[PDB]
Amino acid sequence: VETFAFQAEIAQLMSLIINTFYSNKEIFLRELISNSSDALDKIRYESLTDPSKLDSGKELHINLIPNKQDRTLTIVDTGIGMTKADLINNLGTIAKSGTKAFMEALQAGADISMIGQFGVGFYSAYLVAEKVTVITKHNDDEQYAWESSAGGSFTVRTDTGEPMGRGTKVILHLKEDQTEYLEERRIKEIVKKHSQFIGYPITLFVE
Ligand SMILES: N#C[C@H](CC1CCCCC1)c1n[nH]c2cc(O)ccc12
């Protein structure tokens, strides 16, 4: 288990998301589904030049898994996945410029729902989640588990759990007052409203 400090700009962004009064929390789902969609586009692209990249799984889909017992909402995709380098430094560094631009926009009159237009859409998970776990598997790397309850740090470890093949699993450990996001009709309503034109099948699992 390795512990890392978030880059200063990211930590500020996470504090902003956790502390600002913002009722329109549902936008987190569209951001996560959109990222899943982009990771699926990437793998499909790489498969045109190298068809052997689909050996780790041919199906390109998005699964929404609520679990009321565990109070978790899981977003699973069979996309490109991420390497340990993507989890640690790479994604944090591209986010640096996006965060600055986003924080400047909020000061200029923009709202939190515009987060994805700055490429930092992921962190909107912190509107609803007290902890986020990211399980990922890229073709050129091992299965890793990223985790953060915010507070300026995240952890990375080799995941010894159930193998995935290829893709990313985002586990949202929901805050006590955000259980509506485990309800079928609420999820259906959000997906219909915000993710009506995603080019992959989205399956909402039942409990
Ligand atoms: N971008 C992005 C995040 C990854 C997150 C990893 C840990 C550091 C912060 C970014 C993300 N959210 N949802 C996804 C779905 C994917 O198929 C791949 C990446 C993501």
UniProtKB/Swiss-Prot annotation:
The UniProt record gives the binding positions of ATP as 35, 77, 96, 122
N6-acetyllysine is found on 42, 68
Region annotation (Interaction with NR3C1) maps to 1-207
Summarizing the annotation, the consequence of altering residue 77 to A is: Impaired ATP-binding. Strong interaction with HIF1A, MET, KEAP1 and RHOBTB2. Loss of interaction with HSF1 and ERBB2. Los of interaction with TSC1
Compartment(s) where it occurs, according to its Swiss-Prot or TrEMBL record: Nucleus; Cytoplasm; Melanosome; Cell membrane
Q: How is it modified after translation?
A: ISGylated. S-nitrosylated; negatively regulates the ATPase activity and the activation of eNOS by HSP90AA1.
Annotated membrane-spanning segments are none
Say which family it is in: Belongs to the heat shock protein 90 family.
What exactly does this protein do? Molecular chaperone that promotes the maturation, structural maintenance and proper regulation of specific target proteins involved for instance in cell cycle control and signal transduction. Undergoes a functional cycle that is linked to its ATPase activity which is essential for its chaperone activity. This cycle probably induces conformational changes in the client proteins, thereby causing their activation. Interacts dynamically with various co-chaperones that modulate its substrate recognition, ATPase cycle and chaperone function.
Complex and partners: Homodimer. Identified in NR3C1/GCR steroid receptor-chaperone complexes formed at least by NR3C1, HSP90AA1 and a variety of proteins containing TPR repeats such as FKBP4, FKBP5, PPID, PPP5C or STIP1. Forms a complex containing HSP90AA1, TSC1 and TSC2; TSC1 is required to recruit TCS2 to the complex. The closed form interacts (via the middle domain and TPR repeat-binding motif) with co-chaperone TSC1 (via C-terminus). Interacts with TOM34. Interacts with TERT; the interaction, together with PTGES3, is required for correct assembly and stabilization of the TERT holoenzyme complex.
Which comment does the entry carry about domains? The TPR repeat-binding motif mediates interaction with TPR repeat-containing proteins like the co-chaperone STUB1.
**What's the protein name?**
Heat shock protein HSP 90-alpha
The source organism is Homo sapiens
- What is the name of the gene encoding this protein? HSP90AA1
Interval of the full protein contained in this chain:
17 to 223 of 732
